[PDB]
């Protein structure tokens with residue numbers, strides 16, 4: 575039965591750990607956001623075909639350029655993540671994440687994932703960006719970034735509302751099948 | 752509330768780490784050193800390259816560090832001292848990380864399905880690869896838990912900043928020792 579290694583990369587601001595807990599538990603962790611998501615596997619059916627999905631977190635590695643690539647060999651698909659309310663995290667897709675993923679895994683599919691969709695419409699979030707002369711990342715910005723890095727999909731999601739969350743991981747599996 | 756959630760996660764995940772390293776040693780490594788089965792010539796007498804010093808990291812956490820963290824369970828504001836007390840032990844993650852590419856390549860080029868078969872035989876969810884990344888994950892997670900404790904402990908919390916300093920220094924030195 576086909577086994578899929580999926581590694582989640584991106585800035586601290588994406589909320590990678592919270593994304594994986596929310597997906598795998600089908601609930602925002604709410605009260606307390608755990609710092610640890612240990613290597614995970616579950617059977618998940620996509621288009622009738624059962625698949626064993628492996629998920630690795632990389633939270634804690636954001637500052638260790640030579641440690642992060644130890645996780646990359648034999649990856650079947652990458653989620654390269656940015657927060658839709660962190661223009662710095664989006665630009666880091668181009669500056670940091672795509673280059674090292676492509677250097678180490680030149681033929682491995684990438685899903686570009688915009689997280690924190692729930693906050694793109696948040697008045698307080700929008701105002702805090704406005705004070706820095708910034709705005710949230712919009713849908714065509716993600717499409718244009720996806721095209722530039724060769725991502726097979728651009729997908730937007732919220733761990734809070736679960737909006738688009740299941741689709742991310744379905745499309746990671748589809749990128750490999 | 753928040754410092755208690757953090758300390759509980761520190762302890763629960765430490766137990767899960769000890770369990771994970773134990774499982775790794777008593778399955779993947781034990782099949783090699785056992786003489787139960789035959790070993791591809793590509794990896795014979797190479798268990799020291801595959802597993803690096805993971806035995807010694809396990810002995811540290813299993814014999815010392817879990818037991819000492821548990822004594823800090825009601826003293827989360829002080830737990831940074833545990834990392835200062837035992838800082839020199841963390842140097843063995845520098846050794847482990849240095850060896851990790853050599854481990855991966857040898858598994859890739861020479862192990863064939865030797866470890867995949869052991870995994871199927873024992874019904875493990877985790878591949879040998881999944882186990883051997885765990886020391887790299889763990890050593891870069893302590894700093895996250897110490898940073899969370901700093902968000903919610905008083906300024907009676909330099910029994911955190913020194914600990915975090917150790918647990919930023921260790922992964923940076925491991926990072927800096929890579930080729």
Ligand SMILES: CCNC(=O)Nc1cc(C)on1
Nearest residue numbers: 588589593689690732733734
């Ligand atoms: C602040 C509450 N909103 C979120 O944290 N939303 C998220 C987090 C991740 C990750 O994706 N959406």
